[PDB]
């Protein structure tokens, strides 16, 4: 995708993470599991919700056809009327379809970027304490447990 994460260096999605759009999957002595990251997910949710709302609101002044009639000796103005109403209908149809196509692309890249930025945030944390497998996972050198795992997600993780 533009940011290379989704369907990229992180090959597939997790059917097992139903808690949100982006998250983690740990693995240690105590066990394993998925845990959606509520911060980035909600941040994504607010962004998309505003986007949908903006699109709608921008499409509130579109043209509105009005019925009129013309007699047999008013064919030129009747055609002018017709071309004009169809004209605006085609313009607004174009605006709606194009806006949706363009924003859909941006929405997909937006999720891609959120994943990439979450990954990079973690990578920065696990400075030298973990090994980058290059598949979206980090393998710690010296074992790490549930409290330790929670530390990363806690964003609190730091030797300090």
């Amino acid at each position: 995708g533009l940011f290379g994460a989704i369907a990229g260096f992180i090959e597939g999605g997790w059917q097992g993470m139903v808690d949100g759009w982006y998250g983690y999957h740990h693995s240690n002595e105590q066990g394993s599991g998925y845990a959606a990251d509520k911060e980035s997910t909600q941040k994504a949710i607010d962004g998309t919700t505003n986007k949908v709302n903006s699109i709608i609101d921008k499409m509130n002044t579109q043209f509105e056809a009005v019925g009129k009639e013309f007699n047999n000796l008013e064919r030129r103005i009747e055609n002018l009327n017709k071309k004009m109403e169809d004209g605006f209908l085609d313009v607004w149809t174009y605006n709606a379809e194009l806006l949706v196509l363009m924003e859909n692309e941006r929405t997909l890249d937006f999720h891609d970027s959120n994943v990439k930025n979450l990954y990079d945030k973690v990578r920065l944390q696990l400075r030298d304490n973990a090994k980058e497998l290059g598949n979206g996972c980090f393998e710690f050198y010296h074992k790490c447990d549930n409290e330790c795992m929670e530390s990363v997600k806690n964003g609190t993780y730091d030797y300090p």
């Binding site: 998250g23 013309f70 209908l89 607004w92 709606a96 859909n104 393998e139």
Partner: protein, 321 residues
């Protein structure tokens, strides 16, 4: 021991399009296009439309005998007329500036009928024999009910001089006409005087019509024709009519109520005994969607019309197995 960053996935089958790729399956999407309607003509916010059925606007306003259903219609939300109503001008002819009158209607919600000139008021003219087989009623010759086809009396047609002052608060729509006979012989038989006219004047209207006596093809059995006119008489203004023949005089006129905000919709449907906030000539719409592709001529609070067959926004991410 590992910690992995990842993204959601589900069994979603929903698809969206982008510039570079079509049909991208995504975890979540939002359809924003209404594609359904209820196939009926409903009341708009509790107010029923004026459904003209087989009558045209002209048949209604002039009072074609086949249109008695509309002699005194109540307030309406919108008006529905068929493409080619069979009952319009029963006695054949022309209606001046007809489309402008229809447009005027489209901005009003009520025409309250009032009698401005009693039919019994014609003491020196015959106000009963002006009927035709072209406008039958109960098996006999009749005529538009809202106007009067005046005929000579005792072999004379003394010049008519009538005035009407609009003492109402509303603008008044007044209709009248003139008869164009098939030949001189008919001119004499109905009106006696051979050279006639119908002159009309208000503060703004100035008009004098002369009968064009000729022979044309029969329409509804008539080779003669009627030509109708209309004007809006403002409150406190007066209309003056003068004619020595061929006059189709007003009996009833209409007070105009601009509660304004109507539409003349073309449709073959009849009333559906339902209520809606958005009506199209094909049926009503009830939806939260921002767009619809039902029909472009709608009335009421509606979604925005577009020709699209599909409009779906991506909300979630690419759905990767």
């Amino acid at each position: 021991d590992q910690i992995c960053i990842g993204y959601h996935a589900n069994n979603s089958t929903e698809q969206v399009d982008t510039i570079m790729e079509k049909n991208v399956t995504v975890t979540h999407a939002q359809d924003i296009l209404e594609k359904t309607h209820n196939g009926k003509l409903c009341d708009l916010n509790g107010v029923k439309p004026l459904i003209l059925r087989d009558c045209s606007v002209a048949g209604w306003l002039l009072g074609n005998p086949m249109c008695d259903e509309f002699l005194n219609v109540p307030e309406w939300s919108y008006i529905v007329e068929k493409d080619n109503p069979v009952n319009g001008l029963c006695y054949p002819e022309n209606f001046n500036d007809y489309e402008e009158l229809k447009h005027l209607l489209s901005s009003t919600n009520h025409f309250e009928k009032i009698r401005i000139i009693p039919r019994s008021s014609w003491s020196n003219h015959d106000a009963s024999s002006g009927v035709s087989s072209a406008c039958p009623y109960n098996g006999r010759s009749s005529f538009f009910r809202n106007v009067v086809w005046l005929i000579k009396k005792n072999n004379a047609y003394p010049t008519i001089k009538r005035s009407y002052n609009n003492t109402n608060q509303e603008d008044l729509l007044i209709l009248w006409g003139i008869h164009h006979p098939n030949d001189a012989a008919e001119q004499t038989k109905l009106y006696q005087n051979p050279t006639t006219y119908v002159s009309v004047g208000t503060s703004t209207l100035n008009q004098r019509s002369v009968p064009e006596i000729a022979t044309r093809p029969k329409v509804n059995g008539q080779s003669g024709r009627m030509e109708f006119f209309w004007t809006i008489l403002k409150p406190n203004d007066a209309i003056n009519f003068e004619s020595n023949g061929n006059f189709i005089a007003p009996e009833y006129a209409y007070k105009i109520v601009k509660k304004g905000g109507s539409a003349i919709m073309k449709s073959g449907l009849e009333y559906g005994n339902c209520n809606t906030k958005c009506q199209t000539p094909m049926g009503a719409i009830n939806s939260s969607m921002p767009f619809h592709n039902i029909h472009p001529l709608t009335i009421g609070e509606c979604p925005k019309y577009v020709k699209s067959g599909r409009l779906v926004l991506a909300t979630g991410l690419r759905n990767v197995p």
